[PDB]
């Protein structure tokens, strides 16, 4: 997405950290995943973390 406006833009996105490998496959198929994000300054590469967590 190119910011064609004159104003700065606040952009939000996220990553899902699932519960176990089986859920990973059920939702996304691919077992080993990433999200890379770049702008003129940002250079991000996120990876989901599996952990066993308390329900909230």
Ligand X SMILES: *[C@@H]1O[C@H](CO)[C@@H](O[C@@H]2O[C@H](CO)[C@@H](O)[C@H](O)[C@H]2NC(C)=O)[C@H](O)[C@H]1NC(C)=O
Residue 9 binding target from a copy of itself, ligand X, none, CB below 5 to 8 Å by type: none
Question: By CB under 6 A, what part of segment 15-54 binds ligand X?
Answer: 54
DSSP category for residue 39: S
* Residues near a copy of itself, by CB under 8 A: 17, 36-40, 42-45, 49-54, 56
Matching residue, tokens 């104003």: 7
CA separation, residue 28 to residues 2, 10, 25, 48, 56 (Å): 27, 27, 5, 12, 22
CB of 37 to a copy of itself, least distance (A): 6
Which residues make up the interface to ligand X (CB under 6 A)? 2, 4, 54
């Amino acid at each position: 997405y190119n910011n064609t406006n004159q104003e700065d833009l606040l952009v939000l996105w996220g990553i899902h950290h699932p519960n176990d490998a089986a859920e990973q496959t059920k939702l996304y198929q691919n077992p080993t995943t990433y999200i890379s994000v770049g702008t003129s300054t940002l250079n991000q590469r996120l990876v989901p973390r599996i952990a066993t967590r308390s329900k909230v």
